[PDB]
Amino acid sequence: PKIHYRKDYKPSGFIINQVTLNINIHDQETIVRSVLDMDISKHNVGEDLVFDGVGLKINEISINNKKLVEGEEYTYDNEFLTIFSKFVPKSKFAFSSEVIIHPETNYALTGLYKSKNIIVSQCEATGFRRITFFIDRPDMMAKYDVTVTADKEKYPVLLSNGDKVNEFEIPGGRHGARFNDPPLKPCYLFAVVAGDLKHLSATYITKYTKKKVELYVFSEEKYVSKLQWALECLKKSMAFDEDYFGLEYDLSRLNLVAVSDFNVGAMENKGLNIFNANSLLASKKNSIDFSYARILTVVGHEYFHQYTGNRVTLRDWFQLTLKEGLTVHRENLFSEEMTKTVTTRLSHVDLLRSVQFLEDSSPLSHPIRPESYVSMENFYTTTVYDKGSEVMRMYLTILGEEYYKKGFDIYIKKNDGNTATCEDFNYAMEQAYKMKKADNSANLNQYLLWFSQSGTPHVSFKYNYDAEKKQYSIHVNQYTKPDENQKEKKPLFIPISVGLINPENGKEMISQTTLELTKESDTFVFNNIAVKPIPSLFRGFSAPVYIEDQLTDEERILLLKYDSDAFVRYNSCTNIYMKQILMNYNEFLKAKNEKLESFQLTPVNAQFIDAIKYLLEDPHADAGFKSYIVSLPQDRYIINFVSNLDTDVLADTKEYIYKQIGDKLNDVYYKMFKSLEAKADDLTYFNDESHVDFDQMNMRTLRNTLLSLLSKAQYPNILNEIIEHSKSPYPSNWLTSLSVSAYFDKYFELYDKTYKLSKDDELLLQEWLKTVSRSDRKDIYEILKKLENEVLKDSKNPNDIRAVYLPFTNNLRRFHDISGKGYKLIAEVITKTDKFNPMVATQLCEPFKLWNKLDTKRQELMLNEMNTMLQEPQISNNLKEYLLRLTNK
Ligand SMILES: O=C(NO)[C@H](NC(=O)[C@H]1[C@H]2C[C@@H]3C[C@@H](C[C@H]1C3)C2)c1ccc(-c2cc(F)c(F)c(F)c2)cc1
Ligand SMILES: [Mg+2]
Ligand SMILES: [Mg+2]
Ligand SMILES: [Mg+2]
Ligand SMILES: [Mg+2]
Ligand SMILES: [Zn+2]
């Protein structure tokens, strides 16, 4: 296993100036001819010329049109092509090759492959070497001249990067298209697509240069009616980058293409963005609400890459977070502006603190710029993406919008057209910091520790108020636990956005304030504070940390009801829930351990339940926010706080708490479920795909959340409401009716009904699979076996496999069955998937990430399955590497 180290970066001894490709797609094979116009760099030391080339069948290779001979002048081992240095020219030369590849049987979906009837590439990170020989690293920038030929009937639409400069007929029913893309790019941004594609199009006129840009969105013919929202989102994305960042698209055309088989969400190939169909296609009849926010975010994300990743690219793969963290941050700003709902920010926090915090306290923990890797296919993590985004967002918090924009422009103007590193961005932000602070001695050197230090900081507080002096102090401490990456952790630059709430009237007592904590601890003092305040801490979730607010539940309730910041209200509620959860968990655990015949549980705080009722009944309060306060914290958030977590005890704990609150609020829940119906399910714009109302979708989220709570509670005659809900035109509603019917003998009647509604749309059927997989059923294992035999079968579509199995792994009681049979089942699926798609097999490992946090029996069960997978003779590099790190070997 070759380990690559960040510290070892060195420029290549070679240069590739021009790539000229001919890609000839045939029935049983694709022939790729490539001419590379090359040179010797100032770094050359007479080394052999080594190309990346994986799984290529060589027809011939030449230098300066002289055919090379295998053995004598080169060797190829199916991974590297080595040309012995004595045969490498000492000035500009042409390297040429012709190889054969087989997209039809490329089920790993990397390189050039076939998805249904579409030929499509995926080159990030090191997939270009699966198409032709190359020095496959992002600092090898070159111009591309690409010709694609193919059967015209099967593949009428041909696309690649750049301008289409020729189209031509070929004998025997074939045709070709030539694309020239003069700006330099790294090879991971190369793309080609061939297929019988249908489209929608529009023209966008840029804000300042007034350039006309052609926008095309493509899919297979069957789903062309699902393209409209994506096109609207693309327009919105272009406008936002123009309006917030002053950035305009500078190419003549941008193509978005949906394919059914894709390892991730989408890919920002220059001028030719390629999408998982589930992240591009939607219609109100055939998609759940979540698709609309998903398409907005993924279209936005790929568009924002045009500057942050494409025009400014990466020196090397260790800089990944420079394009991904920064582009997620740009997409978050975009989606917050487009949706205008507080739940947008809250949902990104929720994701970070459950999934990313779990990663950062697991054996997989890494900084957002790792020091090493074995597999790039495993490198695209929530740490790099989501913690990266929070680190990119902290610059905006620290600088404020005016100076952040100044700093961002410096970054773009200094690095446009080049490779860049994380230091380049920090440098640009630093220039703005000096300006904001009005002194050139100010620096952000400490800030760089956010790129290198792993683990989640813990921030805790003590307060003091002098009533005579009208003086309030906030004493703050930070602490990162030592881990495998750093024995000694250093204090970070932590920005703490704060407010001070007057508890008598709920009003703000100070102006907007961001505390700059740069030491292990500091005390922040405020004068002229007329009454003891309740502090509103880390407003907007201003740093990616464990917050320990040291507030009473009474104080947290006051914030939940009256604070101005959505995150702090949501966090205060979260903290009340966590205090209850840990208390009840320990009470149940002790009863279990001691085999007690009787015992007591601490009830849920009554004033807390009253506060939930208060907010729920407030007609001017936000529906999405309301759905968060009636939901307990995510299991994967909770597990970061409990050692040797007994999943059964936690399930019992959650049930007790929900039942406590429902016993008080169920009539309120029901009343709201009924009163919300008219607005939530309004059909006025059902046949307008341009019209998307995120408040209305949040109202449906609330109804569907309440319906779930009422169903579990077996609220009187709630099955009537369930049956009626199943007749709604909105899939979010009728799929909810399936999952909440789990608690009734009508489940399989609804199973069949919703199957019939879903089966004729590929993406809708995937949503139906997810709904079944996640169903709270005692017979869920039998149900899963039925899905396998009747629907999934031997599909190699990652969306199908992920839909059937991942939601089930969140079934706290059943996936974690003490027999270990859920662990055994997912490990079988992982091993089976690893035969043809190692990247997706490793994604299917996600349930095991928390293995060493569970009770010792479940730890042992999970470890046994992971060691079983590790012992498979045919295990991929991806899966082996991942499982070795995860099991601490
Ligand atoms: O950043 C990206 N597009 O701009 C893109 N990432 C994603 O789509 C992520 C984003 C959006 C999603 C939710 C979550 C996981 C998935 C889907 C974060 C992406 C693209 C290519 C790859 C990628 C890397 C490989 F090494 C590889 F072999 C491959 F096939 C794809 C991984 C992530
Ligand atoms: Mg091959
Ligand atoms: Mg405009
Ligand atoms: Mg299919
Ligand atoms: Mg380890
Ligand atoms: Zn990205």
Short mmCIF file of N, CA, C and O in Angstrom, two decimals, residues 582-684:
data_model
loop_
_atom_site.label_atom_id
_atom_site.label_comp_id
_atom_site.label_asym_id
_atom_site.label_seq_id
_atom_site.Cartn_x
_atom_site.Cartn_y
_atom_site.Cartn_z
N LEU A 582 -29.19 11.86 29.20
CA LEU A 582 -28.08 11.23 29.94
C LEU A 582 -28.56 10.76 31.32
O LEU A 582 -28.13 9.71 31.82
N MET A 583 -29.43 11.55 31.94
CA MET A 583 -29.96 11.19 33.25
C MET A 583 -30.80 9.91 33.17
O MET A 583 -30.57 8.95 33.93
N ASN A 584 -31.78 9.89 32.27
CA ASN A 584 -32.65 8.71 32.12
C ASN A 584 -31.85 7.50 31.64
O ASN A 584 -32.08 6.38 32.08
N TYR A 585 -30.89 7.72 30.74
CA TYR A 585 -30.05 6.63 30.27
C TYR A 585 -29.35 5.96 31.46
O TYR A 585 -29.30 4.74 31.58
N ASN A 586 -28.80 6.76 32.36
CA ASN A 586 -28.06 6.19 33.46
C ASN A 586 -29.00 5.46 34.42
O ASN A 586 -28.63 4.46 35.01
N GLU A 587 -30.23 5.96 34.53
CA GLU A 587 -31.21 5.34 35.43
C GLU A 587 -31.63 3.97 34.89
O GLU A 587 -31.65 2.99 35.64
N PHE A 588 -31.95 3.90 33.60
CA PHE A 588 -32.23 2.63 32.94
C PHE A 588 -31.03 1.68 32.99
O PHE A 588 -31.20 0.47 33.19
N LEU A 589 -29.83 2.20 32.74
CA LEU A 589 -28.64 1.34 32.72
C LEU A 589 -28.42 0.68 34.08
O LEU A 589 -28.16 -0.53 34.16
N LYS A 590 -28.55 1.47 35.14
CA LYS A 590 -28.35 0.94 36.49
C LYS A 590 -29.40 -0.11 36.82
O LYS A 590 -29.10 -1.13 37.46
N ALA A 591 -30.64 0.12 36.38
CA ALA A 591 -31.69 -0.85 36.63
C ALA A 591 -31.37 -2.18 35.95
O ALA A 591 -31.56 -3.24 36.54
N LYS A 592 -30.88 -2.09 34.72
CA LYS A 592 -30.47 -3.24 33.92
C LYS A 592 -29.31 -3.98 34.58
O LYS A 592 -29.39 -5.19 34.83
N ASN A 593 -28.26 -3.24 34.87
CA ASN A 593 -27.08 -3.80 35.51
C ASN A 593 -27.39 -4.44 36.85
O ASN A 593 -26.90 -5.53 37.13
N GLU A 594 -28.20 -3.78 37.67
CA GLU A 594 -28.47 -4.27 39.01
C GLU A 594 -29.65 -5.24 39.02
O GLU A 594 -29.97 -5.80 40.06
N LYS A 595 -30.28 -5.44 37.87
CA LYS A 595 -31.45 -6.31 37.76
C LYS A 595 -32.52 -5.95 38.79
O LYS A 595 -33.06 -6.80 39.51
N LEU A 596 -32.81 -4.65 38.85
CA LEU A 596 -33.74 -4.12 39.83
C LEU A 596 -35.16 -4.53 39.48
O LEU A 596 -35.54 -4.54 38.31
N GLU A 597 -35.93 -4.87 40.50
CA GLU A 597 -37.34 -5.18 40.32
C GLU A 597 -38.18 -3.91 40.17
O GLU A 597 -39.26 -3.95 39.62
N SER A 598 -37.68 -2.81 40.73
CA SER A 598 -38.36 -1.53 40.61
C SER A 598 -37.32 -0.42 40.74
O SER A 598 -36.25 -0.60 41.34
N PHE A 599 -37.65 0.74 40.18
CA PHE A 599 -36.75 1.87 40.17
C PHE A 599 -37.49 3.12 39.69
O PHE A 599 -38.62 3.03 39.23
N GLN A 600 -36.84 4.27 39.80
CA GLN A 600 -37.46 5.52 39.40
C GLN A 600 -36.76 6.14 38.20
O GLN A 600 -35.57 5.97 37.99
N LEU A 601 -37.53 6.87 37.40
CA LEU A 601 -36.99 7.67 36.31
C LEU A 601 -37.27 9.13 36.59
O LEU A 601 -38.38 9.47 37.02
N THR A 602 -36.29 10.00 36.33
CA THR A 602 -36.52 11.44 36.42
C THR A 602 -37.44 11.96 35.31
O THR A 602 -37.11 11.82 34.13
N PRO A 603 -38.57 12.57 35.67
CA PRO A 603 -39.45 13.06 34.60
C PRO A 603 -38.87 14.22 33.78
O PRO A 603 -37.98 14.92 34.23
N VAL A 604 -39.40 14.40 32.58
CA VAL A 604 -39.03 15.53 31.75
C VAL A 604 -39.48 16.82 32.48
O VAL A 604 -40.55 16.85 33.11
N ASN A 605 -38.63 17.84 32.44
CA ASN A 605 -38.90 19.15 33.04
C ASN A 605 -40.25 19.71 32.55
O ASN A 605 -40.48 19.84 31.35
N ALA A 606 -41.15 20.01 33.48
CA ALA A 606 -42.51 20.42 33.11
C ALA A 606 -42.54 21.80 32.44
O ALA A 606 -43.36 22.04 31.54
N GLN A 607 -41.66 22.70 32.89
CA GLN A 607 -41.58 24.04 32.30
C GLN A 607 -41.05 23.96 30.88
O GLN A 607 -41.41 24.76 30.01
N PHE A 608 -40.18 22.98 30.63
CA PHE A 608 -39.68 22.73 29.28
C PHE A 608 -40.84 22.32 28.37
O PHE A 608 -40.98 22.84 27.26
N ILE A 609 -41.65 21.37 28.83
CA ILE A 609 -42.80 20.93 28.03
C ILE A 609 -43.74 22.12 27.80
O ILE A 609 -44.20 22.32 26.67
N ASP A 610 -43.95 22.94 28.83
CA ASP A 610 -44.76 24.15 28.67
C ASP A 610 -44.20 25.10 27.60
O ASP A 610 -44.97 25.73 26.86
N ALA A 611 -42.86 25.21 27.53
CA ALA A 611 -42.20 26.07 26.54
C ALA A 611 -42.38 25.55 25.12
O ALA A 611 -42.61 26.32 24.16
N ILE A 612 -42.28 24.24 24.96
CA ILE A 612 -42.58 23.63 23.66
C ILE A 612 -44.01 23.94 23.24
O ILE A 612 -44.26 24.31 22.10
N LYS A 613 -44.96 23.80 24.17
CA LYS A 613 -46.37 24.10 23.87
C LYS A 613 -46.54 25.56 23.44
O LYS A 613 -47.20 25.87 22.45
N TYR A 614 -45.90 26.45 24.20
CA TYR A 614 -45.90 27.88 23.92
C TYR A 614 -45.45 28.19 22.48
O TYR A 614 -46.13 28.93 21.75
N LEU A 615 -44.32 27.64 22.09
CA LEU A 615 -43.79 27.88 20.75
C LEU A 615 -44.68 27.23 19.69
O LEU A 615 -44.99 27.85 18.67
N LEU A 616 -45.07 25.98 19.91
CA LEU A 616 -45.96 25.29 18.98
C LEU A 616 -47.25 26.09 18.71
O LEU A 616 -47.74 26.11 17.57
N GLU A 617 -47.79 26.71 19.75
CA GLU A 617 -49.07 27.40 19.62
C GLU A 617 -48.91 28.82 19.10
O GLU A 617 -49.89 29.51 18.83
N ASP A 618 -47.67 29.25 18.92
CA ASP A 618 -47.43 30.60 18.42
C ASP A 618 -47.54 30.62 16.90
O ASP A 618 -46.69 30.05 16.21
N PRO A 619 -48.58 31.29 16.39
CA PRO A 619 -48.87 31.25 14.95
C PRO A 619 -47.82 31.99 14.16
O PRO A 619 -47.68 31.72 12.97
N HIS A 620 -47.08 32.89 14.79
CA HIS A 620 -46.07 33.67 14.07
C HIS A 620 -44.69 33.02 14.14
O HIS A 620 -43.72 33.56 13.61
N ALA A 621 -44.60 31.86 14.78
CA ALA A 621 -43.35 31.12 14.85
C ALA A 621 -43.18 30.24 13.61
O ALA A 621 -44.15 29.94 12.91
N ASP A 622 -41.95 29.82 13.35
CA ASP A 622 -41.58 29.12 12.12
C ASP A 622 -41.83 27.61 12.17
O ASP A 622 -41.42 26.93 13.12
N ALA A 623 -42.49 27.08 11.14
CA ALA A 623 -42.86 25.66 11.13
C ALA A 623 -41.65 24.70 11.15
O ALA A 623 -41.68 23.68 11.85
N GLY A 624 -40.60 25.02 10.41
CA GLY A 624 -39.41 24.18 10.39
C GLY A 624 -38.73 24.15 11.75
O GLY A 624 -38.30 23.09 12.25
N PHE A 625 -38.63 25.33 12.36
CA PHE A 625 -38.07 25.42 13.71
C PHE A 625 -38.88 24.56 14.68
O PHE A 625 -38.32 23.82 15.49
N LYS A 626 -40.21 24.65 14.59
CA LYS A 626 -41.09 23.85 15.44
C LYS A 626 -40.81 22.36 15.28
O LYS A 626 -40.88 21.62 16.25
N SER A 627 -40.50 21.93 14.06
CA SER A 627 -40.26 20.49 13.84
C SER A 627 -38.97 20.07 14.55
O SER A 627 -38.85 18.91 14.99
N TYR A 628 -38.00 20.98 14.68
CA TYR A 628 -36.78 20.63 15.41
C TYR A 628 -37.03 20.51 16.91
O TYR A 628 -36.47 19.61 17.53
N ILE A 629 -37.87 21.36 17.50
CA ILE A 629 -37.97 21.34 18.96
C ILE A 629 -38.75 20.13 19.49
O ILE A 629 -38.54 19.70 20.63
N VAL A 630 -39.61 19.52 18.66
CA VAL A 630 -40.32 18.32 19.10
C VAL A 630 -39.58 17.02 18.78
O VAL A 630 -40.06 15.93 19.10
N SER A 631 -38.40 17.15 18.19
CA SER A 631 -37.56 16.00 17.83
C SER A 631 -36.38 15.92 18.77
O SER A 631 -35.69 16.92 18.98
N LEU A 632 -36.11 14.73 19.32
CA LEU A 632 -34.93 14.53 20.16
C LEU A 632 -33.66 14.59 19.31
O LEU A 632 -33.69 14.37 18.09
N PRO A 633 -32.54 14.93 19.95
CA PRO A 633 -31.26 14.94 19.22
C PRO A 633 -30.98 13.60 18.51
O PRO A 633 -31.34 12.53 19.01
N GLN A 634 -30.35 13.66 17.33
CA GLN A 634 -29.89 12.48 16.60
C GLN A 634 -29.13 11.48 17.45
O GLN A 634 -28.29 11.87 18.28
N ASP A 635 -29.39 10.20 17.21
CA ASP A 635 -28.63 9.16 17.90
C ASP A 635 -27.14 9.37 17.72
O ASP A 635 -26.38 9.21 18.67
N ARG A 636 -26.70 9.73 16.52
CA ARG A 636 -25.26 9.88 16.32
C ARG A 636 -24.70 11.14 16.96
O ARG A 636 -23.48 11.27 17.08
N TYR A 637 -25.56 12.07 17.36
CA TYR A 637 -25.11 13.20 18.17
C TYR A 637 -24.96 12.73 19.62
O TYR A 637 -23.93 12.98 20.27
N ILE A 638 -25.99 12.04 20.10
CA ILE A 638 -26.03 11.54 21.48
C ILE A 638 -24.83 10.65 21.80
O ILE A 638 -24.23 10.75 22.89
N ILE A 639 -24.45 9.80 20.86
CA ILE A 639 -23.41 8.80 21.16
C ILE A 639 -22.06 9.44 21.50
O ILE A 639 -21.24 8.85 22.22
N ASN A 640 -21.81 10.65 21.03
CA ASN A 640 -20.57 11.32 21.40
C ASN A 640 -20.45 11.63 22.88
O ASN A 640 -19.36 11.98 23.37
N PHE A 641 -21.56 11.49 23.60
CA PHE A 641 -21.61 11.86 25.01
C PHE A 641 -21.70 10.68 25.98
O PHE A 641 -21.75 10.88 27.20
N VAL A 642 -21.74 9.47 25.45
CA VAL A 642 -21.92 8.30 26.28
C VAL A 642 -20.84 7.26 25.99
O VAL A 642 -20.61 6.91 24.84
N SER A 643 -20.18 6.77 27.03
CA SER A 643 -19.23 5.65 26.88
C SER A 643 -19.94 4.31 26.88
O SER A 643 -20.87 4.10 27.66
N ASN A 644 -19.49 3.37 26.05
CA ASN A 644 -20.04 2.00 26.06
C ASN A 644 -21.54 2.03 25.88
O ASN A 644 -22.27 1.37 26.62
N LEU A 645 -21.99 2.85 24.93
CA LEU A 645 -23.41 3.09 24.69
C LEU A 645 -24.19 1.81 24.44
O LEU A 645 -23.94 1.13 23.44
N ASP A 646 -25.12 1.47 25.34
CA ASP A 646 -26.02 0.34 25.15
C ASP A 646 -27.20 0.81 24.31
O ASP A 646 -28.03 1.58 24.77
N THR A 647 -27.26 0.38 23.06
CA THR A 647 -28.28 0.92 22.15
C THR A 647 -29.71 0.58 22.60
O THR A 647 -30.66 1.31 22.29
N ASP A 648 -29.87 -0.51 23.31
CA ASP A 648 -31.19 -0.88 23.81
C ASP A 648 -31.63 0.11 24.90
O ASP A 648 -32.72 0.57 24.91
N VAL A 649 -30.72 0.40 25.81
CA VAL A 649 -30.98 1.36 26.88
C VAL A 649 -31.28 2.74 26.29
O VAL A 649 -32.21 3.43 26.73
N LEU A 650 -30.54 3.13 25.26
CA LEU A 650 -30.81 4.43 24.64
C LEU A 650 -32.19 4.43 23.98
O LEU A 650 -32.93 5.41 24.10
N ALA A 651 -32.54 3.34 23.29
CA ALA A 651 -33.88 3.23 22.70
C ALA A 651 -34.98 3.35 23.76
O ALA A 651 -35.99 4.02 23.54
N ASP A 652 -34.77 2.71 24.90
CA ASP A 652 -35.72 2.78 26.01
C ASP A 652 -35.81 4.21 26.55
O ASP A 652 -36.89 4.73 26.84
N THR A 653 -34.65 4.85 26.67
CA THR A 653 -34.57 6.24 27.12
C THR A 653 -35.35 7.18 26.21
O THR A 653 -36.14 8.00 26.68
N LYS A 654 -35.12 7.09 24.90
CA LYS A 654 -35.81 7.94 23.94
C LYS A 654 -37.33 7.73 24.01
O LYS A 654 -38.11 8.70 24.00
N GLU A 655 -37.75 6.47 24.09
CA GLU A 655 -39.18 6.15 24.17
C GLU A 655 -39.83 6.77 25.40
O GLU A 655 -40.95 7.31 25.32
N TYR A 656 -39.15 6.66 26.54
CA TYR A 656 -39.68 7.24 27.78
C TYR A 656 -39.89 8.75 27.63
O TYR A 656 -40.95 9.27 27.97
N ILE A 657 -38.89 9.45 27.11
CA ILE A 657 -38.93 10.91 26.96
C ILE A 657 -40.01 11.34 25.97
O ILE A 657 -40.79 12.23 26.27
N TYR A 658 -40.06 10.71 24.79
CA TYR A 658 -41.14 11.02 23.84
C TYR A 658 -42.52 10.77 24.43
O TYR A 658 -43.46 11.52 24.17
N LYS A 659 -42.64 9.70 25.21
CA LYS A 659 -43.94 9.35 25.78
C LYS A 659 -44.33 10.37 26.85
O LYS A 659 -45.48 10.79 26.92
N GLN A 660 -43.37 10.78 27.67
CA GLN A 660 -43.59 11.84 28.66
C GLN A 660 -44.15 13.13 28.03
O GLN A 660 -45.12 13.73 28.51
N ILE A 661 -43.50 13.57 26.96
CA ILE A 661 -43.91 14.79 26.30
C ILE A 661 -45.23 14.59 25.56
O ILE A 661 -46.13 15.42 25.66
N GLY A 662 -45.37 13.47 24.85
CA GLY A 662 -46.63 13.22 24.16
C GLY A 662 -47.82 13.11 25.10
O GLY A 662 -48.93 13.55 24.78
N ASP A 663 -47.61 12.52 26.28
CA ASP A 663 -48.71 12.43 27.25
C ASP A 663 -49.25 13.82 27.64
O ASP A 663 -50.40 13.94 28.09
N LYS A 664 -48.42 14.85 27.49
CA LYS A 664 -48.85 16.22 27.74
C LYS A 664 -49.28 16.96 26.47
O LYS A 664 -50.22 17.75 26.51
N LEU A 665 -48.61 16.71 25.35
CA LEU A 665 -48.83 17.58 24.20
C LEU A 665 -49.56 16.94 23.02
O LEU A 665 -49.75 17.60 22.01
N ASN A 666 -49.99 15.69 23.15
CA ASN A 666 -50.55 15.03 21.97
C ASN A 666 -51.77 15.74 21.40
O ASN A 666 -51.94 15.77 20.19
N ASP A 667 -52.63 16.28 22.27
CA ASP A 667 -53.81 16.98 21.76
C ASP A 667 -53.40 18.24 20.99
O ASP A 667 -54.01 18.60 19.98
N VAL A 668 -52.37 18.93 21.48
CA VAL A 668 -51.80 20.04 20.73
C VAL A 668 -51.23 19.59 19.38
O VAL A 668 -51.45 20.24 18.36
N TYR A 669 -50.49 18.47 19.39
CA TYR A 669 -49.93 17.95 18.14
C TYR A 669 -51.06 17.69 17.13
O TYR A 669 -50.98 18.09 15.98
N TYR A 670 -52.12 17.04 17.59
CA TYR A 670 -53.21 16.69 16.70
C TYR A 670 -53.92 17.93 16.11
O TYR A 670 -54.18 18.01 14.91
N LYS A 671 -54.22 18.88 16.99
CA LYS A 671 -54.82 20.14 16.60
C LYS A 671 -54.00 20.86 15.52
O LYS A 671 -54.54 21.35 14.53
N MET A 672 -52.69 20.90 15.71
CA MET A 672 -51.83 21.51 14.70
C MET A 672 -51.80 20.71 13.42
O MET A 672 -51.85 21.29 12.33
N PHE A 673 -51.71 19.39 13.53
CA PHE A 673 -51.71 18.55 12.34
C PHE A 673 -52.93 18.85 11.49
O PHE A 673 -52.84 18.91 10.27
N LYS A 674 -54.07 19.05 12.14
CA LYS A 674 -55.27 19.36 11.39
C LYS A 674 -55.26 20.81 10.89
O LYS A 674 -55.66 21.08 9.77
N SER A 675 -54.79 21.76 11.71
CA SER A 675 -54.92 23.16 11.31
C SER A 675 -53.92 23.55 10.22
O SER A 675 -54.19 24.47 9.45
N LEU A 676 -52.79 22.84 10.15
CA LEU A 676 -51.73 23.13 9.19
C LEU A 676 -52.07 22.64 7.78
O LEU A 676 -51.38 22.98 6.81
N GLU A 677 -53.10 21.80 7.67
CA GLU A 677 -53.35 21.05 6.44
C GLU A 677 -53.55 21.94 5.20
O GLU A 677 -52.94 21.69 4.15
N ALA A 678 -54.41 22.94 5.32
CA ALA A 678 -54.74 23.80 4.19
C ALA A 678 -53.51 24.44 3.56
O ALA A 678 -53.30 24.35 2.34
N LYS A 679 -52.67 25.08 4.38
CA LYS A 679 -51.47 25.73 3.85
C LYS A 679 -50.38 24.75 3.46
O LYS A 679 -49.70 24.94 2.44
N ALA A 680 -50.19 23.72 4.28
CA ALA A 680 -49.12 22.77 4.05
C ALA A 680 -49.32 22.06 2.73
O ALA A 680 -48.37 21.86 1.98
N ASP A 681 -50.56 21.69 2.42
CA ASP A 681 -50.80 20.82 1.28
C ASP A 681 -51.44 21.55 0.11
O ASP A 681 -51.95 20.92 -0.81
N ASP A 682 -51.39 22.87 0.16
CA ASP A 682 -51.92 23.72 -0.92
C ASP A 682 -51.44 23.24 -2.31
O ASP A 682 -50.24 23.07 -2.54
N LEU A 683 -52.39 23.01 -3.22
CA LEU A 683 -52.08 22.49 -4.55
C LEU A 683 -52.08 23.57 -5.65
O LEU A 683 -51.99 23.22 -6.83
N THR A 684 -52.18 24.85 -5.28
CA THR A 684 -52.24 25.94 -6.25
C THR A 684 -51.13 25.87 -7.29
O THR A 684 -51.39 26.06 -8.49
#
